Ligand binder design. Structure first.
Ligand SMILES: O=C(O)c1ccc2c(c1)nc(Nc1cccc(Cl)c1)c1ccncc12
Length: 322
């Protein structure tokens, strides 16, 4: 909320540029003048209470992981400190590279080479499973929350070092806590249908993330609940009967079916740009297919019967990493 370059925060950090913006506010690269000049990333949070207590939660999550895993072994972003600055909350992070979304974005939305996807997939899975081990759900996993450590590339840009870290913990919730409904192009189905969530909804996102690394685009491109539900079914097949029945938000559930118009102009938009999952493959080579096996397991409709990351890390697709 209106900052600028060359500025100084809390008499220590000097803004050099802006790494990105969001509804919460922004992230800037600074020079830390009281730590020898190290570049760091600083998250300045708009002074709206909604974002202010998200930030406060985030700080306690970040402090938990940071003490439990001070080595960043499990690759969750490291918080260096926080402060207040004219009513704005500021969180200081280790400085990292581009988002995976941003990197793809500036590469013509070319996808990642499968061997890079594998190492990325492994680290995300391993990192979030850590959160999962500690009674935490991220709820907000997306390609934009996964950043390369160094995002240098050769060039059709080829990424040098696919090492990543997992970042935004504003939304992360403990099991010991009340389970929200916030708002998003990667929400699990047990989330849209207001049926309760927990660790298995992180796994859903990871599936969606891995389709995107593979194709270079998303396959659930709509911030509309109905459109999404229909996309889900064209790609993954029929929604389980029981979930449709035991849903509080039983608005678009007519005669126990999805009350969507396959016949409407908007319907054709859903059909014209979505096919069954396995039709998205671009090779039928063995390792392409191990991957889609994993993705299909991750995209199981029933969170109760959905693969866990503890399992996912043992899947065939990762064998070459061993
Ligand atoms: O939320 C965090 O924990 C969080 C923590 C660290 C970074 C971050 C978000 N976002 C960066 N980039 C970014 C890119 C686009 C939009 C926005 Cl808002 C931010 C970034 C860059 C370099 N080093 C650390 C970070």
């Amino acid at each position: 909320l209106i900052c600028q370059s060359g500025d100084v925060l809390s008499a220590r950090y000097e803004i050099v540029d802006t790494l990105g913006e969001g509804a919460f506010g922004k992230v800037v690269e600074c020079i830390d003048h009281k730590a020898g000049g190290r570049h760091v990333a600083v998250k300045i949070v708009k002074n709206v209470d909604r974002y202010c207590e998200a930030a406060r939660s985030e700080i306690q999550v970040l402090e938990h992981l940071n003490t439990t895993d001070p080595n960043s072994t499990f690759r969750c972003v490291q918080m260096l400190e926080w402060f207040e600055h004219h009513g704005h909350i500021c969180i200081v992070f280790e400085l990292l590279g581009l988002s995976t979304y941003d990197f793809i974005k500036e590469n013509g939305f070319l996808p990642f080479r499968l061997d890079h996807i594998r190492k990325m997939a492994y680290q995300i899975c391993k990192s979030v499973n850590f959160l999962h081990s500690n009674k935490l759900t991220h709820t907000d996993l997306k390609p934009e929350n996964i950043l390369f450590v160094q995002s240098d590339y050769t060039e059709e840009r080829t990424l040098i070092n696919p090492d990543i870290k997992v970042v935004d913990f504003g939304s992360a919730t403990y099991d010991d806590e009340h389970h929200s409904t916030l708002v998003r192009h990667y929400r699990a189905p047990e989330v849209i249908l207001a049926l309760g969530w927990s660790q298995p909804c992180d796994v859903w996102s990871i599936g969606c993330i891995l389709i995107e690394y593979y194709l270079g685009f998303t396959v659930f491109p709509t911030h509309d609940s109905k459109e999404h539900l229909a996309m889900m079914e064209r790609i993954l097949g029929p929604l389980p009967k029981h979930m449709i029945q035991k849903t509080r938000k039983r608005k678009y559930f007519h005669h126990d079916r999805l009350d969507w118009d396959e016949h409407s102009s908007a319907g054709r938009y859903v059909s014209r740009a979505c096919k069954p999952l396995k039709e998205f493959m671009l090779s039928q080579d063995v390792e392409h297919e191990r991957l889609f096996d994993l993705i299909q397991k991750m995209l199981e409709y029933d969170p109760a019967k959905r693969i866990t990351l503890r399992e996912a890390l043992k899947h065939p697709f990762f064998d070459l990493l061993k």
